């Protein structure tokens, strides 16, 4: 059964930009790709309905080509509406199969986060609940590992991360980590830190506080 | 026996949807007209749905008439309930139940019957939040924090608008308690703390709840 | 302009099983192969399952293929997903989407899609009860309360069975928290609080947690 | 169509021939059912057509009228009669039910022994206060609680539970815990609990002051 090799998994690029994607079928297909875009938590939208063939009420910035095995897509000069993922699709008559899509985004040097670490409000506190926020500012690109580390114990599975996309001024990534404790737990121990690595970073990055201090 | 299994119960709010489904053995579904009842409150039974042989006929008691909608699925022997719209009144057990007779017939009693599944439609249909300062140790970061809210979005800003550059609102994320929380943060000059007073006028729109936060050095 | 309205997602426990729906708007789907698919929390779209026109032939994606059944109504233009037993890698959004083109043919792509709804499976499939005293201030009352346990059922027992005049082991309650908590009581003559030692003993096979509790004044 | 039942409670010993009787608002001819329901289980057919008794039904159960008027007697009531009871009108395809009649074995008034817990210390600590009332061995079923925090009238904060019939003195009891933060409960001190029930010429009250 056909896997599609779509390439590249991130493109960098900015405002103006034509930019070139390329799908490579794990087996050969008779030319039955199409191509999506997906914003981030929509839904796809289609762009092209058969490899080179673009769909009706779609940009004319759009194209693309197929081989049987090889294929891509391209866009002839990205506009800020374009900053979105890339999907292609091999269609049979009652399945489909996707590429891991080419996540399209807008370029700058690599930027290191600015770490900042939070303790629990004493408000949140006495309600009985600590929820420890970890925040990495501004960085470029997306890729980066944060690890709670409570009395020197490396934790595991109880924080949650959320990514704001890029920024309207300075195209940067922002990362923020909750690690949640009952107020019970979080009384039992002291030092609470957060450790950073990135594509910036020529080592990790850790936060700490003292609980009370 | 004959063999029903009810799927899909459990908590949900008002205001909510679900669907239930109920799955068979023991017998094929195709040749009989197929039910979902539920036991209210009070220990009485209600009739919620019927569906008849071939989906020819829908039914509905009126007081889920036009919010849910019954459907069936021979050919794998599955039937369905949507509940678009539950209100607290749609608290109870359901069950899926086979209309039957040893010698089936145009108009007959129920028969056979799944063991059910319990629905609660808590009243929390808009849960307000709860907002907490997250308060400043050059640049100094400070920031709000919401926990305890459903539906989304709650919404957020800086003294009414005066303050833009280095403000960012956090996408929410979804506890184990089933409510969302999130943060909004700024960053701004270290030398502007003693100076400025930094609030958070913030909104959670399904609830209409507004509040506000004054977030200051500790 | 075309629409499709996915409903009955939120929050799951592994192995728990939830179904959802797809309804549609401006258009009727018995025309149409109908289509779920997903995005997990790595971003990309997995495709999930497809029925047919005509409710002929149903698939799946393989790792869903067996555990999951599609469904349809070609007459209230409704489509269905029962998800028996989910996996924690089952969380996503779920889409519904319709095969489709102006001209329809044996093979087109997917144009027109719903806005999609969250699916959270929670990776903690049973979980094991507290167990705390409630303690005996004639006849006086002791008892065991059993909390935050997760399925059904717990039961208990005092002294290890040899305790059963007068023991009242409740119905469980549904908190709103979605877990079961349970009150397991017994009279004894108060003239034994001193020197007779009482234990409730509290299984919950389904976590296999076993907790034997003392019960004395406080 | 619309349907009446009654009588809504009926307290009889075993071994006695007892009649239910189910009226509709119009003439239903004998297009009506009637059904057994237990406790936490889906309602069982017992007869169909006014009097046609289902396959397996124990022939003490009985139905009969049409019209308006029909009746549903059990002669001889054994310890697995004492159930829920339901006539169900029926029609080609639809059905309406009637509010039901519950049956329980008869025993004199018993008032409730009522008795106040605070919450325990270990779980005050968590931050979640839980005090229980409980209302113990009394007959008939109907009792109602209501709680008092300073004298304030309790509402939307409790939940309640009641036995079914003990089996060697056919009481009930009842439990209903009143549910607080810990930020909520240390606001007010008394914490009362007032029954009424028919057994009680006036209300009962027990209470605590917090702490």
């Known amino acids: 059964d056909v896997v599609m090799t779509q390439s590249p998994s991130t493109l960098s690029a900015s405002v103006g930009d034509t930019i070139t994607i390329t799908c490579r079928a794990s087996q050969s297909i008779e030319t039955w790709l199409a191509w999506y875009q997906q914003k981030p938590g929509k839904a796809p939208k289609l762009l092209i309905y058969?490899?080179?063939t673009l769909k009706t009420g779609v940009p004319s910035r759009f194209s693309g080509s197929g081989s049987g095995t090889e294929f891509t897509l391209t866009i002839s000069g990205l506009q800020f509406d374009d900053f979105a993922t890339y999907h292609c699709?091999?269609?049979?008559?009652?399945?489909?199969?996707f590429g891991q899509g080419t996540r399209v985004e807008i370029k700058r040097t690599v930027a290191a986060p600015s770490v900042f670490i939070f303790p629990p409000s004493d408000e949140q506190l006495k309600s009985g609940t600590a929820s420890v926020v970890c925040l990495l500012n501004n960085f470029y690109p997306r890729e980066a590992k944060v690890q709670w580390k409570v009395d020197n114990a490396l934790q595991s599975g109880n924080s949650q991360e959320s990514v704001t996309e890029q920024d309207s001024k300075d195209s940067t990534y922002s990362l923020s980590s909750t690690l949640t404790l009952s107020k019970a737990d979080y009384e039992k121990h002291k030092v609470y830190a957060c450790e950073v690595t990135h594509q910036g970073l020529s080592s990790p990055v850790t936060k700490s506080f003292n609980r009370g201090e | 026996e004959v063999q029903l299994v009810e799927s899909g119960g459990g908590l949900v709010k008002a205001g909510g949807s679900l669907i239930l489904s109920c799955?068979?053995?023991?017998?094929?579904?195709?040749?009989?007209?197929?039910?979902?009842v539920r036991r209210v409150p009070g220990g009485g039974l209600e009739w919620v749905a019927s569906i008849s042989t071939s989906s020819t006929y829908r039914d509905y008691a009126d007081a889920v008439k036009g919010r849910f909608t019954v459907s069936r699925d021979d050919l794998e022997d599955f039937v369905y309930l949507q509940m678009h719209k539950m209100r607290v009144e749609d608290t109870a057990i359901y069950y899926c139940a086979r209309k039957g007779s040893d010698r089936l017939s145009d108009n007959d009693p129920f028969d056979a019957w799944g063991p059910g599944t319990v629905v609660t439609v808590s009243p929390a249909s808009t849960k307000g939040p709860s907002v907490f300062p997250l308060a400043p140790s050059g640049t100094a970061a400070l920031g709000c924090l919401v926990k305890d809210y459903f539906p989304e979005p709650v919404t957020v800003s800086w003294n009414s608008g005066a303050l833009t550059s280095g403000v960012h609102t956090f996408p929410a994320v979804l506890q184990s308690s089933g409510l969302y929380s999130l943060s909004s943060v700024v960053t701004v000059p270290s030398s502007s703390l003693g100076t400025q007073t930094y609030i958070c006028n913030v909104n959670h729109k399904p609830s209409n709840t507004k509040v506000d936060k004054k977030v200051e050095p500790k | 302009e075309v629409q499709l309205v996915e409903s009955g997602g939120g929050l799951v426990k592994a192995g728990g099983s939830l179904i959802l729906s797809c309804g549609v708007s401006?258009?009727?789907?018995?025309?149409?192969?109908m289509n779920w698919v997903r995005r997990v929390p790595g971003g990309g779209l997995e495709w999930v399952a497809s029925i047919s026109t005509s409710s002929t032939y149903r698939d799946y994606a393989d790792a869903v293929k067996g555990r999951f059944t599609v469904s349809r109504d070609d007459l209230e233009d409704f489509v269905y997903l029962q998800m028996h037993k989910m996996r924690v890698e089952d969380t996503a959004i779920y889409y519904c989407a319709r095969k489709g083109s102006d001209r329809l043919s044996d093979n087109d792509p997917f144009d027109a899609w719903g806005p999609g709804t969250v699916v959270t499976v929670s990776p903690a499939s049973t979980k094991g009860p507290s167990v705390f005293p409630l303690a005996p201030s004639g006849t006086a009352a002791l008892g065991c309360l059993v909390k935050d346990y997760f399925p059904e059922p717990v039961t208990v027992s005092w002294n290890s069975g040899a305790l059963t005049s007068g023991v009242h082991t409740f119905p469980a309650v549904l908190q709103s928290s979605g877990l079961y908590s349970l009150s397991s009581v017994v009279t004894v003559p108060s003239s034994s609080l001193g020197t007779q030692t009482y234990i409730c003993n509290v299984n919950h096979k389904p976590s296999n947690t076993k907790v034997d509790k003392k019960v004395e004044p406080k | 169509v619309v349907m009446t039942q009654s009588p809504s409670t009926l307290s009889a010993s075993v071994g006695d021939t007892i009649t239910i009787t189910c009226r509709a608002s119009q003439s239903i001819e004998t297009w009506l059912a009637w059904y057994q329901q237990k406790p936490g289980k889906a309602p069982k057919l017992?007869?169909?057509?006014?009097?046609?008794?289902?396959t397996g039904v124990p022939s003490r159960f009985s139905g009969s009228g049409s019209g308006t008027e029909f009746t549903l007697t059990i002669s001889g009531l054994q310890f697995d009669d004492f159930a829920t009871?339901?006539?169900?009108?029926?029609?080609?395809?639809?059905?309406?039910?009637?509010?039901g009649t519950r049956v329980e074995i008869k025993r004199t008034v018993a008032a409730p022994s009522v008795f106040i817990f605070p919450p325990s210390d270990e779980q005050l600590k968590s931050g979640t206060a839980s005090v229980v009332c409980l209302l113990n061995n009394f007959y008939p079923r109907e009792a109602k609680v209501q709680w008092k925090v300073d004298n304030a009238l309790q509402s939307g904060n409790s939940q309640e539970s009641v036995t079914e019939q003990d089996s060697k003195d056919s009481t009930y009891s009842l439990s209903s815990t009143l549910t607080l933060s810990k930020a909520d409960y240390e606001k007010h001190k008394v914490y009362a609990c007032e029954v009424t029930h028919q057994g009680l010429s006036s209300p009962v009250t027990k209470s605590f002051n917090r702490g």
């Open positions: 401006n258009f009727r789907i018995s025309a149409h192969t």
């Open positions: 699709q091999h269609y049979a008559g009652y399945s489909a199969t």
């Open positions: 058969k490899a080179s």
